[PDB]
């Protein structure tokens, strides 16, 4: 049936544009951060606890576990 009518509604252009822009920038910086975190976790991090060897004094950043924290 060719009874298609017009739906009067406010402009959804600006709302959609703002949402797209916000998502674009958030992802623009979050995707590299997530990729870097994943690579660091798989390849490098998660040190294991040890005893301090006698006669050796560690530096301040050697008392932490996660590599990004160090």
């Amino acid at each position: 049936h060719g009874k298609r009518l017009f739906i009067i509604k406010p402009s959804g252009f600006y709302d959609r544009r703002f949402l797209k822009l916000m998502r674009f920038y958030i992802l623009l910086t979050g995707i590299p951060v997530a990729i870097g975190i994943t690579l660091v976790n798989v390849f490098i991090g998660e040190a294991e606890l040890a005893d301090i060897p006698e006669g050796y004094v560690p530096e301040h950043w050697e008392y932490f576990k996660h590599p990004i924290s160090r």
Partner: protein
């Protein structure tokens, strides 16, 4: 601490040497950069403090307040960009200068190793706010509002200077570290009672305590949007921070001294929440909600328990963010309608759906919906008050119910129903306003993931 202070000072020559059409962009970019630098301060220790020098220190009570203060300036610039379009370049630069000076005074106030320096900056914040209120204000009652705001604060804080100089003459120091380490009990004496009153009233009047809160509705309603944002977000927390810093020397006098103020705050939260139910102005309603929240913070500080302090810090941060967002939403409505009356513009969800979503989220956060940090502070303070006395639960529950009631009343009156027919100048919401609301709301939901960052030194 100078790595934050010096860029804030350099904001002034950068603003005054900027092009006529590049002040806002440069100010926003450099304010955001300054805020990023401030993030480093959050790392805090379970031990004493971050004592940078003899003049300034940082603590996990001062760090969230400093971060919020640095974060607020770009939002205030974004909000002020609109209504100052037809203003001369010199006056816009003067407005930005006032905002920068206020930020600098607040930043130096929150570190403040010594109490007279704290008083000096705590009073220096009074001038830029007064100029902003009484110069860039729309109505004719801005002059009376500024007079009230000035004189309430000064009448409250003048005895504090005498109390501080007397304390330094007797003890010998006003450095907070020495004050904490060499603290001595206060004997129950009339002179000690009046010293307690002089130390407490200056911070009470700026909370505002119920019965001394008259200046706040005037100042908030008559101020421009940036002034309302800063007053609701940071300037109210100065009294709470000062009380938290100064209640170390008021013991054991505080145990019985606190009763008049505890009763006033406990009944005044109910009074102001009920006032919010019958209000024809958005800004007045938001201001009275702020009064209720700050009264509950006063109760928390007066109880003086670790859970009280953690809840008070969390509630201060959450209330600052929520009140700023609510004021921004009200200003977005006002710049379209030019009325500032709840019942005029109705059914705005049909015309502005995303702004209605922002309204809903802001109302839910003000309603203290879990697991938001608003409810974290609310619940910690409620538990501490219950441990103080099991009968407080009635007043706390009444306040919670009335708070939900007027929050949803404000949401429904403006967003739901039928649109006003004769209003036809409601243009689509700009990207600037949407970004302002997003930058208000996202930090709250990110902070609820790491509540330990805003729970203060007693965590």
């Amino acid at each position: 601490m100078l790595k934050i202070i010096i860029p804030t000072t350099m904001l002034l020559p950068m603003t005054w040497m900027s092009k006529h059409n590049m002040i806002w962009i440069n100010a926003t970019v450099h304010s955001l950069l300054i805020s990023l630098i401030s993030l480093s301060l959050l790392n805090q220790l379970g031990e004493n403090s971050l004592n940078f020098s003899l003049t300034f220190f940082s603590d996990s009570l001062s760090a969230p307040l400093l971060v919020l203060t640095t974060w607020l300036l770009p939002l205030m610039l974004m909000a002020s960009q609109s209504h100052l379009s037809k203003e001369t370049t010199t006056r816009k630069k003067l407005y930005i200068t006032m905002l920068i000076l206020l930020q600098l005074f607040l930043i130096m106030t929150f570190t403040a190793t010594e109490l007279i320096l704290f008083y000096i900056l705590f009073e220096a914040t009074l001038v830029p706010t007064l100029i902003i209120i009484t110069r860039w204000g729309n109505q004719t009652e801005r002059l009376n509002a500024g007079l009230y705001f000035l004189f309430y604060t000064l009448a409250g804080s003048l005895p504090l200077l005498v109390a501080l100089v007397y304390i330094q003459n007797t003890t010998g120091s006003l450095n907070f570290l020495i004050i904490h380490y060499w603290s001595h009990p206060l004997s129950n004496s009339w002179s000690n009672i009046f010293m307690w009153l002089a130390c407490i009233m200056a911070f009470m009047v700026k909370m505002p305590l119920y019965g001394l809160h008259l200046w706040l509705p005037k100042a908030h309603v008559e101020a421009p949007i940036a002034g309302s944002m800063v007053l609701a977000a940071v300037l109210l927390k100065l009294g709470g921070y000062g009380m938290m810093r100064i209640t170390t020397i008021l013991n054991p006098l505080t145990n019985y001294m606190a009763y008049p103020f505890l009763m006033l705050s406990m009944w005044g939260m109910i009074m102001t929440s009920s006032i919010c139910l019958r209000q024809t102005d958005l800004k007045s309603l938001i201001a009275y909600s702020s009064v209720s929240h700050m009264a509950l913070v006063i109760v928390a500080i007066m109880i003086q328990t670790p859970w009280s302090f953690m809840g008070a810090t969390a509630l201060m941060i959450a209330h600052g963010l929520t009140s700023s967002m609510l004021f921004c939403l009200a200003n977005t409505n006002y710049e379209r309608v030019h009325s500032r009356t709840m019942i005029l513009a109705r059914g705005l969800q049909t015309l502005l759906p995303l702004m209605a979503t922002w309204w809903l989220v802001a109302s839910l956060t003000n309603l203290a919906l879990p697991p938001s940090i608003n409810l974290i502070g609310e619940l910690f303070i409620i538990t501490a008050s219950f441990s103080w006395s099991n009968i407080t639960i009635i007043l706390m529950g009444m306040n919670m119910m009335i708070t939900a009631l007027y929050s949803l009343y404000m949401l429904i009156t403006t967003q739901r129903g039928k649109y006003t027919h004769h209003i036809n100048n409601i243009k689509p919401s700009f990207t600037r306003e949407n970004a302002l609301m997003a930058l208000h709301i996202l930090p709250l939901l990110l902070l609820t993931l790491n509540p330990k960052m805003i729970l203060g030194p007693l965590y």
